[PDB]
Design a protein around this motif. Structure first.
Motif, PDB file in Angstrom:
ATOM      1  N   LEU A 123       0.839  -1.202   0.000  1.00 14.44           N
ATOM      2  CA  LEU A 123       0.000   0.000   0.000  1.00 14.44           C
ATOM      3  C   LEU A 123       0.877   1.256   0.000  1.00 14.44           C
ATOM      4  N   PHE A 124       0.825   2.018  -1.093  1.00 18.63           N
ATOM      5  CA  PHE A 124       1.551   3.288  -1.220  1.00 18.63           C
ATOM      6  C   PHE A 124       0.571   4.457  -1.123  1.00 18.63           C
ATOM      7  N   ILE A 125       0.839   5.395  -0.211  1.00 17.53           N
ATOM      8  CA  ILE A 125      -0.017   6.572  -0.008  1.00 17.53           C
ATOM      9  C   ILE A 125       0.836   7.842  -0.041  1.00 17.53           C
ATOM     10  N   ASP A 126       0.491   8.751  -0.952  1.00 19.07           N
ATOM     11  CA  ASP A 126       1.130  10.057  -1.062  1.00 19.07           C
ATOM     12  C   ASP A 126       0.013  11.088  -1.287  1.00 19.07           C
ATOM     13  N   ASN A 127      -0.359  11.919  -0.304  1.00 20.77           N
ATOM     14  CA  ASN A 127       0.270  12.081   1.016  1.00 20.77           C
ATOM     15  C   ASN A 127      -0.808  11.985   2.101  1.00 20.77           C
ATOM     16  N   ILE A 128      -0.528  11.237   3.171  1.00 19.95           N
ATOM     17  CA  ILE A 128      -1.528  10.974   4.223  1.00 19.95           C
ATOM     18  C   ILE A 128      -1.879  12.213   5.070  1.00 19.95           C
ATOM     19  N   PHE A 129      -0.956  13.171   5.188  1.00 19.12           N
ATOM     20  CA  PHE A 129      -1.249  14.465   5.841  1.00 19.12           C
ATOM     21  C   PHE A 129      -2.477  15.162   5.244  1.00 19.12           C
ATOM     22  N   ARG A 130      -2.640  15.052   3.927  1.00 18.82           N
ATOM     23  CA  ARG A 130      -3.728  15.722   3.206  1.00 18.82           C
ATOM     24  C   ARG A 130      -5.117  15.232   3.635  1.00 18.82           C
ATOM     25  N   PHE A 131      -5.191  13.982   4.090  1.00 22.80           N
ATOM     26  CA  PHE A 131      -6.404  13.432   4.712  1.00 22.80           C
ATOM     27  C   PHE A 131      -6.754  14.161   6.021  1.00 22.80           C
ATOM     28  N   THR A 132      -5.747  14.424   6.857  1.00 20.48           N
ATOM     29  CA  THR A 132      -5.929  15.208   8.091  1.00 20.48           C
ATOM     30  C   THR A 132      -6.245  16.678   7.787  1.00 20.48           C
ATOM     31  N   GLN A 133      -5.542  17.243   6.803  1.00 19.04           N
ATOM     32  CA  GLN A 133      -5.756  18.626   6.358  1.00 19.04           C
ATOM     33  C   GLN A 133      -7.180  18.847   5.853  1.00 19.04           C
ATOM     34  N   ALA A 134      -7.655  17.925   5.018  1.00 20.42           N
ATOM     35  CA  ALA A 134      -9.032  17.957   4.512  1.00 20.42           C
ATOM     36  C   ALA A 134     -10.068  17.801   5.634  1.00 20.42           C
ATOM     37  N   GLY A 135      -9.728  17.009   6.652  1.00 26.05           N
ATOM     38  CA  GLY A 135     -10.540  16.882   7.862  1.00 26.05           C
ATOM     39  C   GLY A 135     -10.725  18.183   8.626  1.00 26.05           C
ATOM     40  N   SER A 136      -9.668  18.993   8.710  1.00 29.01           N
ATOM     41  CA  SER A 136      -9.750  20.312   9.361  1.00 29.01           C
ATOM     42  C   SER A 136     -10.661  21.287   8.600  1.00 29.01           C
ATOM     43  N   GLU A 137     -10.683  21.170   7.273  1.00 32.19           N
ATOM     44  CA  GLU A 137     -11.499  22.042   6.416  1.00 32.19           C
ATOM     45  C   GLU A 137     -12.997  21.791   6.594  1.00 32.19           C
ATOM     46  N   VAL A 138     -13.397  20.520   6.594  1.00 32.79           N
ATOM     47  CA  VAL A 138     -14.800  20.151   6.855  1.00 32.79           C
ATOM     48  C   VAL A 138     -15.207  20.431   8.309  1.00 32.79           C
ATOM     49  N   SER A 139     -14.286  20.190   9.245  1.00 32.80           N
ATOM     50  CA  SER A 139     -14.521  20.422  10.679  1.00 32.80           C
ATOM     51  C   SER A 139     -14.889  21.873  11.014  1.00 32.80           C
ATOM     52  N   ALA A 140     -14.305  22.821  10.279  1.00 30.72           N
ATOM     53  CA  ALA A 140     -14.604  24.250  10.440  1.00 30.72           C
ATOM     54  C   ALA A 140     -16.065  24.579  10.127  1.00 30.72           C
ATOM     55  N   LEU A 141     -16.552  24.090   8.986  1.00 30.66           N
ATOM     56  CA  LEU A 141     -17.933  24.344   8.547  1.00 30.66           C
ATOM     57  C   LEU A 141     -18.967  23.362   9.119  1.00 30.66           C
ATOM     58  N   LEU A 142     -18.513  22.266   9.730  1.00 26.96           N
ATOM     59  CA  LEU A 142     -19.380  21.450  10.599  1.00 26.96           C
ATOM     60  C   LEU A 142     -19.702  22.172  11.918  1.00 26.96           C
ATOM     61  N   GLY A 143     -18.861  23.135  12.302  1.00 31.66           N
ATOM     62  CA  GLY A 143     -19.103  23.993  13.462  1.00 31.66           C
ATOM     63  C   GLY A 143     -18.398  23.562  14.736  1.00 31.66           C
ATOM     64  N   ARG A 144     -17.521  22.559  14.639  1.00 30.75           N
ATOM     65  CA  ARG A 144     -16.787  22.055  15.804  1.00 30.75           C
ATOM     66  C   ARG A 144     -15.780  23.086  16.300  1.00 30.75           C
ATOM     67  N   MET A 145     -15.548  23.093  17.611  1.00 31.50           N
ATOM     68  CA  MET A 145     -14.568  23.995  18.216  1.00 31.50           C
ATOM     69  C   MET A 145     -13.157  23.481  17.940  1.00 31.50           C
ATOM     70  N   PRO A 146     -12.245  24.378  17.515  1.00 34.68           N
ATOM     71  CA  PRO A 146     -10.908  23.947  17.117  1.00 34.68           C
ATOM     72  C   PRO A 146     -10.027  23.550  18.302  1.00 34.68           C
ATOM     73  N   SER A 147      -9.034  22.706  18.028  1.00 40.18           N
ATOM     74  CA  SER A 147      -8.041  22.290  19.015  1.00 40.18           C
ATOM     75  C   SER A 147      -6.746  23.080  18.777  1.00 40.18           C
ATOM     76  N   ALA A 148      -5.617  22.567  19.270  1.00 36.09           N
ATOM     77  CA  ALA A 148      -4.319  23.234  19.125  1.00 36.09           C
ATOM     78  C   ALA A 148      -3.923  23.446  17.659  1.00 36.09           C
ATOM     79  N   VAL A 149      -3.378  24.632  17.372  1.00 38.63           N
ATOM     80  CA  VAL A 149      -2.973  25.055  16.017  1.00 38.63           C
ATOM     81  C   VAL A 149      -4.138  25.004  14.998  1.00 38.63           C
ATOM     82  N   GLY A 150      -5.356  25.274  15.471  1.00 34.15           N
ATOM     83  CA  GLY A 150      -6.545  25.311  14.619  1.00 34.15           C
ATOM     84  C   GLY A 150      -7.055  23.999  14.034  1.00 34.15           C
ATOM     85  N   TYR A 151      -6.516  22.862  14.481  1.00 33.92           N
ATOM     86  CA  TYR A 151      -6.919  21.554  13.946  1.00 33.92           C
ATOM     87  C   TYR A 151      -8.267  21.115  14.508  1.00 33.92           C
TER      88      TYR A 151
END
Ligand SMILES: Nc1ncnc2c1ncn2[C@@H]1O[C@H](COP(=O)(O)OP(=O)(O)O)[C@@H](O)[C@H]1O
Ligand SMILES: Nc1ncnc2c1ncn2[C@@H]1O[C@H](COP(=O)(O)OP(=O)(O)O)[C@@H](O)[C@H]1O
Ligand SMILES: Nc1ncnc2c1ncn2[C@@H]1O[C@H](COP(=O)(O)OP(=O)(O)O)[C@@H](O)[C@H]1O
Ligand SMILES: Nc1ncnc2c1ncn2[C@@H]1O[C@H](COP(=O)(O)OP(=O)(O)O)[C@@H](O)[C@H]1O
Ligand SMILES: [Mg+2]
Ligand SMILES: [Mg+2]
Ligand SMILES: [Mg+2]
Lengths: 469, 57, 462, 462, 308
Positions: free
Chosen positions: D242-270
């Motif tokens: 299994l080759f994945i480039d890049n797995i960070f982008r999955f977390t990054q995309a999660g932060s983008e949806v999390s903002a407009l879902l209305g959740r309160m942010p954690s450290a460094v805006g995540y």
């Protein structure tokens, strides 16, 4: 017409009642002619970002649907014209008469829709064309501090496309309007304006227009790409756009992160530069080349926004401040600048002559901050540095570049003093253009280097006539 | 001896001249790191205060 | 016109409710009659809903009561313009604070407006000849340009400001404006009297946004001075000067207003509208087809950090820097402009000529070499230097003295009468020194003179 | 098929009102017909109340209107699995994007599922030879283990993972899976044709949800490729890469949806659910008793900050880590692997042998002392070091250069042909350097070569 | 760094032969240490003079918020009503502020800087100003003060400084070397450090120690890169004496025998002043550094040097 009424407004962000059938991302028009963008569709209301001056918009002010997704005018009507991000003319030369339009937000070409970049986009700048060559459909970041020569690379690249059938789009985001007025005047004097579109959102313009400016310019470039032609887009600069988008996001109370930017700040630039591409033969074979700008602070390439755009583009051209303010212009940092496309974006002659030129100069600069063998490399290095120095607004044809680089790298300027190298180059090319024109024309037509023995004699013939200091 | 002493002090000029130039290079690098941390610290501190206030309202 | 009621008073913020369909525009001045005499002016900022308008106060909110009448003026803060403003001291609202009678202007212009349109703008850089040798040669001002003024206390900052007002008025016929953003009241009083004594009072309109006024007042005071400068450019075609001291305190005021309005802060605690506010101020300062406004701006740098958002955003607009050095003032070299640290974007063969650039760079290279040899000269001695350096050191000392100049404003200090030196004379003078035409003259001859002819004329008297 | 109505549209988030009793479950796919033609797939996330479901869109929401019909599919996003996926290119929804007709696959498996049970798990305690000297020696990868390639912008993550595809996957008996997550679409087009020419494509299923795509697609695209890899593991009993480039982008995309879902942010805006979301994805990527998955994941490091929440939380899910560093890349040391920060669970005498372990720790002891002397060496050079440290520094610099290596994939950039170094040669080469056997040879002889024999040969023509 | 070990030693030294009464307040600290101290006070016989209160870190915030007031009210009685001297030991007063910080947001208060309550100074002052001597009676208050993240600029310890007549400033870098008690010789201060109170010799010797140690700190960054032998003969002698002075400032405690592995030592003031005076004058320049480390008097340092 379908109407709505403003119930709250502040900092150019409004909440509108009504507009029941409005689309997400729809273009809207207020009473006084100012345009707006329906961002969020709420249960009972609509979130509207004002795309212009908002000092006549208030509670009670009315706004209507256009029925159109956020879009701009496109086509040959914009050639030689200065516009804002909405496509409204700022030059005062009458309206933009056009039937063709394209959306601000638009999908990038798919995986099968592309082809590998194999066609040169000549900047006319020796340092770039030889060491960091740009191809048609490539994305090449131009990055460096304030006043390190970023805009000059873009304007000289645009000037060099005269008679090459390449449409140019200079997107000015957050710049002084003085400089954009200077740019358009420079293009007029060099006969580069008639194939160039100027999109400008100045520093006095509200933040949403800075935000939209690159996407409007991208759409204008995309029109020509998908019709089989080739285009060049310049974003000067994405640091102003990123900062403008941060303002909008903080006004909307969206959660900030690193350097107070929102979580979709990478996505801001990534979807923009993905739309720049080299299309396949099935899709017409057209292209859109992108030159995004990033302005660093104290040469810090490891900062958040610089590392975002390095992570998007196909290599970068870093402009060193210390070199720029010590005679070396353009101040290309050979150590960290790179073109991913590389040799595929160069003609055969330029590839062969300047094959190891970047690493040779990278080694020279390392040896400079420090024998007989290495003494010869320092003397050769100083002379090659003088060749890669170049005046602003003076592009060089690729056939003339390869001859100049061939001469210095093979050692035809070693006996000549270092201070006479710039004059040696200039006079050598006058000799080559006037008398030995068949050697230059061979490079123009085929792309390959001439006969080695014949070119060596032609250079040695000139050296007899030359007189040093 | 006198000629060797001249060579010693000349060699110390060059070595400590380099050490001075190296110190100024490092001092700039540290000043960039400091102002990176100073700006990051103020950005984080004020963000936590405003986040805490918005949670109540 | 529109009339409303105060519903809330919370520090320098005032919420005012208006009737339906008749609300004030954003940035409109709204007057409120005080219960104990006088009038408070507030500026409309946010439309909150339910016909309520949040406003930023330009003076104290103490004594206000909920339910008092608030009158919409129908426009932004409008201030007097033209020759009636000359020799007068104003506040943010365009009212005189000098107690010198009536200000009989014909027009009043709003302080909030868009920048000049693309079609109006000048399309090429032009030098603004100050008549000051060091500035014109090494770090020249551009018409419509912005200059960063740096320097410590007691180095000739106020004297240089007064000389620029005098020289542009005398030779170019361009008037001036001084905007004291966060002015200390003691220093505003001193500056008024200092400008009266020098005589440059008559060529300048002064506007103070004093330290002890609210953040709204100090935020908009630069726009008041700017509007007065714009009249002389647009109507009378002048190359106007606009002094802003201190431009950081304009940014500081914006951050304070942003905190009062309850906006989410940006990086390093600054307002999210940092670039927008700076750009909307700065873009109005420019060269049009009719005239220009050139701005000399004093800039505080927080924590000596030039990458900080306040100076970094300000430096995006600057075309030059005038860096005053205390060591030159101690030597008697006035004006005490650092000839190596001061820079200009328009120092090139395109804007100024090929000769100007060659001479300017030659002066810099000679002065830089002399600066590098200070440690070698002090310990080893002059015999350590080679024959090439000895000549460079001699010319550098002559060059450093020829960069000094007697000022019209500083006749009391120096004793001699002031001098305006044209660019061509400045270029010619330093060219001749670099070529070695005046090597045999004494060093005192080059000190405190105008043209190169005055240096030769001084040599016979020594 | 139960119907619903759109109530709100907020970027990639859509709220849909359903009738009472017909409420879709969390993670269920919901289709909406656009007014402009085509279908938008949408994924249920939160139950807000009053039979309203907040959802995350898998594509753009521009053009949507309130009141449009939404159809619940009755299950999560389901994608093709098995032999039909081999040699094919997919998107987040499991639809073919290669223009090679329909994908005639029997089963459609849901992209969401629980992690494997504890008893199903299988520990990876066997070395996987990469042929790369730094990895094999200092931080070796494990067969059926979890590997992470950390690095900042432009340091060499994609070049490294492509080299690992070249070295490992070409001569691999089992199957392969590549996942393009939030990276360049061009690189997917390059890797398709690169694998097509070499013939490796026929045993490779590919999935792409690149940096052009909206955040919902970038969030779930890794699960699409993972589900295909899970089928080969469990049902067919295969050894999968299994080759994945890049797995960070999955977390990054999660932060983008999390903002407009209305959740309160954690450290460094995540997003507050950063660790849980990562764990729910990562724990499925594992070897089992039925079959093995050898996962190699590129991991982006924001602003070169390894303490950033995204890469920091990723470390827990890895058996081996390759920590790339910009300083080494700018020095010309490629691959730019930090030899001390890079770690591996299988670097022990039991797995790699006693000699391998002793040589590996000997190298790290030399480099650790060299690292401690950097502050002194930066200022004073190597002149004030002791005789012992002078030898350590000399050996460290040679070790540092022998750790570099020319790559097959980097032939286009450098010009040098790539080299594959066996483990025995790597252990032998660094052993001889530690023993002082090549103290006579110059430093550049160790730079960019394969075996120690090639360094001996390179020294002759130098 | 050593707050609890220090306060326990001050109980052992000061409160043992104390004619008046005492109060101990355990505020948000370890329950183990409360049990240790109780049984230690029971064995020594000090328990009969001492009222004890405990509201430890196991307890909810409200208990930790008000437990110091419970102890203080008992101390206030012994000050005002009865005619007898009082010793008030608090470990740790920071936990009062932290307890207030825990409940602050739930009480509906917007946060201040560094996550603290907006009423930090007012809440501290209204507790602290009660802890004092008056015309009616004498309270000698000794309070342990936690410094979060070793950061003295933190709002809690920064605000506490205003309420003190003497401050013992512990630092980790001294504790990291093994210098115990890890007392900062420069940053520690006292209102009674003057010739009028302690005499002209005491003040001169104390000031002499600080100047030698100040000069050593200025040279540490210079020595680290450029080396030891490049200094002058005066500076080399200052470095040698500073390191010996720093080690003679260390001391073995009666309560810390299980950590030091040696018997504790009590040193009189006149003996202490004599010891450091002789080191400044240069009478023990030939003794090694370890001789000065972990001893009582200067005589014990002379005896220890013979073993080495
Ligand atoms: N090759 C060059 N030769 C001479 N001058 C140059 C050259 N490139 C740029 N300049 C000048 O240097 C200044 C900075 O260039 P510019 O492109 O404006 O940098 P930036 O856009 O990064 O601020 C300009 O005044 C420009 O005229
Ligand atoms: N051009 C000049 N010539 C002679 N003396 C000067 C000149 N400029 C300043 N000085 C001297 O320096 C003093 C301070 O000048 P000022 O402009 O008030 O400095 P600042 O505004 O920086 O405090 C003056 O009183 C004067 O004696
Ligand atoms: N092994 C290597 N050898 C030579 N150059 C390399 C190597 N790895 C990376 N580079 C250089 O760095 C550039 C960026 O590599 P890339 O893998 O795209 O970085 P990332 O994926 O971490 O952003 C390449 O185009 C190349 O010039
Ligand atoms: N005077 C001392 N002598 C020897 N060791 C000490 C001394 N003070 C502290 N320590 C060591 O440090 C540890 C922590 O001390 P303690 O007083 O519990 O710290 P705190 O400042 O957190 O209350 C002790 O258990 C002991 O090991
Ligand atoms: Mg520019
Ligand atoms: Mg990559
Ligand atoms: Mg304790």
């Amino acid at each position: 017409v379908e109407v709505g009424t403003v119930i709250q407004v502040g900092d150019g962000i409004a909440r509108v009642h009504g507009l029941e059938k409005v689309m997400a991302g729809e273009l809207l028009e207020f009473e006084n002619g100012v345009m707006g963008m329906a961002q969020n569709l709420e249960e009972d209301n609509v979130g509207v970002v004002i795309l212009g001056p908002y000092t006549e918009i208030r509670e009670g002010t009315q706004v209507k649907r256009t029925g159109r997704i956020m879009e701009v005018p496109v086509g040959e009507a914009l050639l030689g014209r200065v516009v804002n991000p909405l496509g409204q003319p700022l030059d005062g030369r009458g309206p933009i008469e056009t039937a063709e339009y394209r959306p601000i937000e638009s999908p990038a070409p798919g995986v099968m829709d592309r082809k590998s970049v194999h066609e040169p986009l000549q900047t006319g700048i020796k340092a770039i064309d030889s060491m960091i060559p740009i191809g048609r459909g490539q994305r090449e970041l131009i990055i460096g501090d304030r006043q390190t020569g970023k805009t000059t690379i873009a304007i000289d690249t645009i000037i060099n496309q005269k008679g090459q059938d390449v449409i140019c789009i200079y997107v000015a985001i957050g710049q002084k309007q003085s400089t954009v007025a200077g740019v358009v005047e420079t293009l007029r004097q060099h006969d580069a304006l008639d194939y160039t579109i100027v999109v400008t959102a100045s520093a006095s313009e509200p933040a949403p227009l800075l935000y939209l400016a690159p996407y409007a310019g991208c759409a204008m470039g995309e029109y020509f790409m998908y019709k089989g032609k080739h285009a060049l887009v310049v974003y000067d600069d994405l640091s102003k756009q990123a900062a403008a988008y941060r303002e909008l996001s903080l006004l909307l109370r969206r959660p900030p992160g690193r350097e107070a930017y929102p979580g979709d700040v990478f996505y801001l630039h990534s979807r923009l530069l993905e739309r720049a591409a080299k299309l396949s033969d099935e899709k017409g074979g057209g292209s859109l080349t992108a030159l995004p700008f990033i302005e660093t602070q104290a040469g810090d390439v490891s900062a958040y926004i610089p590392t975002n755009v390095i992570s998007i583009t196909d290599g970068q051209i870093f402009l060193e401040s210390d070199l720029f303010y010590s005679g070396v212009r353009p101040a290309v940092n050979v150590g960290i600048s790179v073109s991913r496309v590389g040799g595929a974006a160069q003609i055969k002659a330029m590839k062969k002559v300047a094959g190891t030129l970047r690493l040779d100069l990278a080694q020279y600069r390392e040896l400079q901050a420090f024998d007989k063998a290495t003494q010869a490399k320092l003397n050769r290095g100083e002379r090659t540095v003088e060749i890669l120095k170049q005046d602003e607004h003076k592009p060089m044809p690729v056939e003339e570049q390869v001859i100049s680089i061939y001469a210095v790298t093979n050692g035809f300027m070693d006996d000549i003093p270092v201070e006479d190298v710039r004059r040696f180059e200039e006079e050598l090319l006058s000799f080559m253009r006037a008398n030995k024109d068949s050697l230059l024309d061979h490079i123009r037509q085929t792309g390959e280097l001439p006969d080695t023995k014949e070119l060596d004699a032609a250079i040695e013939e000139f050296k007899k006539g030359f007189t040093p200091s | 001896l006198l000629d060797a002493k001249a060579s010693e002090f000349g060699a110390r000029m060059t070595a400590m001249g380099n050490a001075t130039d190296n110190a100024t290079e490092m001092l700039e690098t540290l000043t960039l790191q400091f102002n990176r941390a100073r700006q990051a610290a103020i950005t984080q501190e004020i963000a936590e205060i405003v986040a805490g206030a918005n949670a109540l309202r | 016109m529109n009339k409303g009621r105060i519903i809330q008073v919370m520090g320098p913020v005032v919420d005012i409710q208006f009737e339906s369909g008749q609300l004030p525009d954003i940035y409109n001045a709204i007057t409120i009659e005080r219960p104990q005499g006088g009038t408070l002016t507030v500026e409309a900022a946010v439309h909150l809903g339910d016909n309520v308008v949040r406003c930023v106060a330009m003076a104290s909110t103490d004594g206000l009561v909920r339910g008092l009448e608030a009158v919409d003026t129908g426009a932004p803060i409008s201030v007097p313009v033209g020759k009636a403003t000359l020799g007068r001291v104003f506040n943010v609202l365009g009212e005189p604070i000098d107690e010198q009678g009536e200000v009989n202007a014909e027009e009043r212009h709003p302080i909030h407006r868009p920048a000049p349109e693309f079609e109006e703008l000048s399309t090429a850089d032009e030098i603004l000849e100050t008549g000051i040798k060091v500035i014109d040669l090494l770090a020249p001002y551009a018409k419509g340009g912005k200059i960063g003024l740096f320097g410590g206390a007691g180095v000739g900052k106020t004297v240089l400001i007064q000389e620029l007002i005098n020289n542009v008025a005398q030779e170019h016929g361009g008037l001036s404006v001084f905007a004291g953003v966060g002015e200390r009241t003691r220093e505003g009083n001193d500056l008024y009297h200092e400008m009266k004594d020098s005589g440059v009072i008559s060529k300048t309109s002064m506007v103070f946004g004093q330290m002890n006024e609210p953040p709204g007042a100090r935020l908009r005071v630069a726009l008041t001075g700017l509007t007065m400068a714009e009249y002389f450019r647009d109507r009378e075609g002048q190359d106007v000067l606009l002094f802003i001291d201190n431009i950081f305190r304009f940014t500081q005021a914006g951050s304070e207003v942003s905190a009062l309005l309850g906006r989410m802060p940006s990086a390093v605690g600054y307002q999210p509208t940092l670039a927008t506010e700076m750009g909307q101020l700065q873009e109005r300062i420019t060269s049009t087809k009719k005239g220009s406004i050139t701005s000399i701006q004093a800039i505080y740098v927080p924590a000596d950090d030039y990458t900080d958002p306040a100076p970094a955003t300000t430096f995006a607009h600057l075309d030059a820097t005038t860096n005053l050095e205390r060591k030159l003032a101690e030597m008697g070299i006035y004006p005490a402009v650092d000839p190596l640290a001061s820079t200009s974007r328009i120092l090139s063969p395109a804007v100024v000529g090929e000769e100007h650039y060659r001479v300017a760079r030659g002066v810099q290279q000679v002065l830089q070499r002399y600066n590098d040899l200070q440690d070698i000269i002090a310990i080893l001695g002059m015999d350590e230097l080679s024959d090439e350096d000895k000549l460079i050191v001699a010319r550098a000392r002559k060059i450093q003295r020829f960069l000094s100049q007697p000022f019209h404003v500083a006749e009391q200090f120096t004793g001699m009468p002031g001098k305006y030196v044209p660019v061509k004379e400045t270029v010619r003078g330093f060219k001749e020194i670099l070529e070695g035409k005046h090597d045999n003259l004494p060093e005192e001859a080059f000190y405190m003179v105008g043209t190169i002819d005055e240096a030769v004329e001084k040599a016979k008297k020594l």
